[PDB]
Design an enzyme around this catalytic site. Sequence first.
Site, mmCIF file in Angstrom:
data_model
loop_
_atom_site.group_PDB
_atom_site.id
_atom_site.type_symbol
_atom_site.label_atom_id
_atom_site.label_comp_id
_atom_site.label_asym_id
_atom_site.label_seq_id
_atom_site.Cartn_x
_atom_site.Cartn_y
_atom_site.Cartn_z
ATOM 1 C CG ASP A 173 -1.813 1.234 1.279
ATOM 2 O OD1 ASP A 173 -2.051 1.840 0.218
ATOM 3 O OD2 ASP A 173 -2.273 1.590 2.387
ATOM 4 C CG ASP A 203 -3.743 4.685 -2.307
ATOM 5 O OD1 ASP A 203 -3.187 3.622 -1.977
ATOM 6 O OD2 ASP A 203 -4.712 5.173 -1.688
HETATM 7 C C1 LIG Z 1 -7.298 -4.027 -1.207
HETATM 8 C C2 LIG Z 1 -8.206 -3.436 -2.345
HETATM 9 N N1 LIG Z 1 -8.658 -2.104 -1.952
HETATM 10 C C3 LIG Z 1 -9.938 -1.639 -1.944
HETATM 11 O O1 LIG Z 1 -10.874 -2.362 -2.244
HETATM 12 C C4 LIG Z 1 -10.086 -0.214 -1.557
HETATM 13 C C5 LIG Z 1 -9.253 0.353 -0.572
HETATM 14 C C6 LIG Z 1 -9.337 1.712 -0.223
HETATM 15 C C7 LIG Z 1 -8.468 2.300 0.795
HETATM 16 O O2 LIG Z 1 -8.899 3.093 1.631
HETATM 17 N N2 LIG Z 1 -7.167 1.916 0.737
HETATM 18 C C8 LIG Z 1 -6.231 2.174 1.836
HETATM 19 C C9 LIG Z 1 -5.570 0.860 2.345
HETATM 20 C C10 LIG Z 1 -6.512 -0.336 2.474
HETATM 21 C C11 LIG Z 1 -6.106 -1.562 1.911
HETATM 22 C C12 LIG Z 1 -6.906 -2.737 2.073
HETATM 23 C C13 LIG Z 1 -8.103 -2.649 2.790
HETATM 24 C C14 LIG Z 1 -8.537 -1.435 3.346
HETATM 25 C C15 LIG Z 1 -7.745 -0.273 3.187
HETATM 26 C C16 LIG Z 1 -5.245 3.200 1.324
HETATM 27 O O3 LIG Z 1 -4.208 3.411 2.279
HETATM 28 C C17 LIG Z 1 -5.949 4.578 1.269
HETATM 29 N N3 LIG Z 1 -5.004 5.664 0.922
HETATM 30 C C18 LIG Z 1 -5.710 6.927 1.196
HETATM 31 C C19 LIG Z 1 -5.013 8.074 0.613
HETATM 32 C C20 LIG Z 1 -6.266 7.551 -0.031
HETATM 33 C C21 LIG Z 1 -10.282 2.548 -0.869
HETATM 34 C C22 LIG Z 1 -11.147 2.021 -1.866
HETATM 35 N N4 LIG Z 1 -11.967 2.928 -2.564
HETATM 36 C C23 LIG Z 1 -12.656 4.014 -1.826
HETATM 37 S S1 LIG Z 1 -12.403 2.733 -4.129
HETATM 38 C C24 LIG Z 1 -13.867 1.682 -4.141
HETATM 39 O O4 LIG Z 1 -12.760 4.029 -4.656
HETATM 40 O O5 LIG Z 1 -11.383 2.001 -4.801
HETATM 41 C C25 LIG Z 1 -11.040 0.623 -2.177
HETATM 42 C C26 LIG Z 1 -7.543 -3.403 -3.680
HETATM 43 C C27 LIG Z 1 -8.072 -4.179 -4.728
HETATM 44 C C28 LIG Z 1 -7.442 -4.231 -5.980
HETATM 45 C C29 LIG Z 1 -6.254 -3.530 -6.222
HETATM 46 C C30 LIG Z 1 -5.729 -2.706 -5.184
HETATM 47 C C31 LIG Z 1 -6.377 -2.626 -3.943
#
Ligand SMILES: C[C@@H](NC(=O)c1cc(C(=O)N[C@@H](Cc2ccccc2)[C@H](O)CNC2CC2)cc(N(C)S(C)(=O)=O)c1)c1ccccc1
Length: 379
Positions: free
Chosen positions: A38, A222
Amino acid sequence: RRGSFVEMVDNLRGKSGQGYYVEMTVGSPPQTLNILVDTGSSNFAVGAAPHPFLHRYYQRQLSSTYRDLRKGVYVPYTQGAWAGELGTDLVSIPHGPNVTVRANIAAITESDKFFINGSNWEGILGLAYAEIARPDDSLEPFFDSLVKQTHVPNLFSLQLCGAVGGSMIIGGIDHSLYTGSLWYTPIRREWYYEVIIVRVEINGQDLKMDCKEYNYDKSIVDSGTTNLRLPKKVFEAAVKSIKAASSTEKFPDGFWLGEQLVCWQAGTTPWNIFPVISLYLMGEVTNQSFRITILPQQYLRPVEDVATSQDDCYKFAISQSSTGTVMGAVIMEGFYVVFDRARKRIGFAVSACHVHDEFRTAAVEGPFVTLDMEDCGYN
Ligand SMILES: C[C@@H](NC(=O)c1cc(C(=O)N[C@@H](Cc2ccccc2)[C@H](O)CNC2CC2)cc(N(C)S(C)(=O)=O)c1)c1ccccc1
């Protein structure tokens, strides 16, 4: 052509669009876990107690090298949050650099909508800077520890291959992971991996918005965020243009909002009717920029098949944000991205694994002449 970093190639895996993870081994004796990469956060944390979505977890009592920092930590993300206890332990990446360091590690004991069912990862590696680390910037991030304790160069690169695998080269760049040249954009400030977008086009057509709108608040790279997230006003204009460009077939309004999915007979998806999207980024020379272009294969993401059926369902993966532009996996999957921390810049090159067809391909092109790019950033 050659590859001294060959052992780091293909060190990333994924459970069909649920996050890209790398194996990391912590403690003594060894405890290996799957860790999500991440670049959108700065805390290294691992599940440390049973959970319905976790196959395994970190057992601190079994690690003789574990040191409790006697302080708790709470980390909220755009999606999900977790609570844990801070400590330090020995950490190595089997298919990463040949070193072992003592790093801060948050043992996750409770969480809410963080772990994903069937994703196969049990922790997260925050690769961003100390400024955004929790509880505060005194908690040294993993990469900072790696660079301070070893001679591994202050740089890493990511090749995320969508549909699941990829590569995280630590300490350098691997030429077999990309074609063409690498184009660099400055890291504006060291907190998130912040960059500056100076122009946006849909099928060659300029969206014609003041560039300040594209970076209102901020624009970041990100790997932990799935979508290409855009500020409200930008999202609306982008969708209007994308819809106009794909008029050969109409879709319900909810599709563009991600609320509805559209499925096609296996292998009949008309990618050709959807436009390409280009983001222009500030270059390394005055008044010079370059552009990265993605295909619908990147912004239209597959949704876990019902059961090996003959229907390919997709979700429009461009959404809105109120915290700036977030160039997530939708953007990264079409390229090999170099996080050159040493030279405060991020490079982009066409990925050797990006998904495309026989008519169009993702691209990184330049240079272009763009004036007054400095004013595009938010103060
Ligand atoms: C893991 C998964 N991420 C997701 O499904 C996913 C994760 C986040 C999210 O908050 N990601 C976190 C880490 C974080 C990592 C894992 C779990 C929770 C938080 C990251 O540090 C955020 N960084 C903030 C500066 C923006 C946000 C979203 N969105 C709001 S979206 C729908 O618009 O895309 C989707 C993913 C899927 C495919 C490829 C990459 C990431």
